[model samples]
Target: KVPRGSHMWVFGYGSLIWKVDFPYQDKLVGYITNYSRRFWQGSTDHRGVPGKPGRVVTLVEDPAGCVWGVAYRLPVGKEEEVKAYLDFGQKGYRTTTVIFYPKDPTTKPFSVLLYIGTCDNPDYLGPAPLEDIAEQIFNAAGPSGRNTEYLFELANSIRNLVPEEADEHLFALEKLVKER
Candidate 1:
């Protein structure tokens, strides 16, 4: 349950990492254990036409490992707005609270609210190749902007956190966009 009056955090592994338009008080480079984003869940609604399912991404838990993402600390009273926005786009996802640990370990612990995609959606297919993922990023657009732009910003943010480990997905996207 969302804590009353306590600040909340949202973990952004994909587009949210860059296109977070909500009112957030702060952001941190955080590593979340047991969660990773994959393009396994095809887009049935958000990324493509409402019923014309296409490739998209979702978060899944990895029992023995963790996924790294940027965590946004929302303003004290803005949790409801943030949650509603995420829910609007993540209709098929199950929202849950999880503990988010800082990559630096020395920072304080924060509670992260995450959305796990359902495995039952007809479009909940399996992972697509990196090139295909890149293409999707290149062609898609939303209220935010071109999806590729989100990938670009995400890549830059990750690079700022750990230059050597910038997401290769964005590298593929960069190549794809440049060739256009």
Candidate 2:
């Protein structure tokens, strides 16, 4: 069984890359394998209201897939506190462990906690046409902020942080949302 009471690393492939409002001692730029990021999750609590929902990224299983993200090392003794905060902030998503490969080739890969939303969740939106997804993001807003803000911020952050990689799905959505 996995042991407890030690420093932990949480992977942030979505908003956490930019909106890191949690307590963490260190961070690393990395990527995870066998998963692809897609805006297939519906957000009612944070990015939309009860009836309507905004689109957000979720990791979909893909044989040859990989996603670039940031991994934050939880501060010593703050594991419980950070987990509680992330559980509340993440809402419908569930956490799982994944291997994180640091951007620097010299650094060794390690396992990190990753939050994901699968098809079973009631709020699940699955895949949709790019135009339709963009339209939803353009008109949705919730307690967090406008949906447009989420898309734009994420796109900008990924561009600045991981300049070499190209996230076609995310960039396409960003462009479509901006044109609205």
Candidate 3:
């Protein structure tokens, strides 16, 4: 059962880390194992239009891998409101639960909500080579903003969270888009 006056945890491995619009009491650098981040999700709402979608992050199952990200603690009583906001922004994403490993080992791991882009969704991009993905991102724009800005911000954010650990996939795409 859900506890009364309890805070809700939101896991963000993408733009939410940088462009978080919701109010939160705390932020924690965390990791989610058994999954990895990929830029194969198509973004038709925030990052691109219906005709030309932009690539966005989604979790890919990887038994040996982990995804580095940030977790936000939404204040008590705000869960419903924040969730509604997230649902609107995360239109095509489906919810799943994942265990979050907080950087502070003393806190212990906990289950949190995760929004992922499923392939069955109309906005799903499925997969593409990194070069092709980068080129598409470089040319895409949406009502929210430029797609490149979203890509660059997410890469910069992950770098900030784990400075010593490089996200080769994200940075590589950023480099590809910047070079053109």
**Model 3 lDDT per residue over 38-127, tens place:** 888888888888999888888888898788889998878888798889889766778888899998867878888888777777777777
Error of 3 at 112 (Å): 1.2
lDDT of 1 by residue, 1-180 (tens): 455666778887776765776788878887777665565665544555444444455777777556677888878877788778878976577888888878786787777888787877666877777777766656766543455565566667677776534445445655666676
Best first by TM-score, ranked:
2, 3, 1
Kindly state the number of residue pairs that clash in model 1. 0
Per-prediction CA RMSD (Å): 4.3, 3.5, 2.9
**lDDT score for candidate 1 against the true structure:** 0.68
- lDDT, candidate 2, 1-180, per-residue tens: 454578789998888898888888889988999899999988888888889999988899888898998999988788878888888865567788999999888878999998888577888889999999999999999999998999998999889877635588999899888786
Best of the candidates, lDDT: 2
Model 1 alpha-carbon drift over 4 Å, by segment: 1-5, 44-47, 50-54, 135-147, 164-180
Evaluate all candidate structures by whole-model CA lDDT and list the values in order: 0.68, 0.87, 0.84
| Candidate 3 residue 62 C-alpha distance from true site, Å | 1.8
RMSD of 2: 3.5
Model 1 scores worst on lDDT over the 10 consecutive residues at 44-53
Residue 35 error for model 2, in Å?
Answer: 0.8
Question: How would the candidate models be sorted by lDDT, starting from the highest?
Answer: 2, 3, 1
**Could you tell which candidate, 1 or 2, scores higher by lDDT?**
2
Q: How does each model score on TM-score?
A: 0.72, 0.90, 0.88
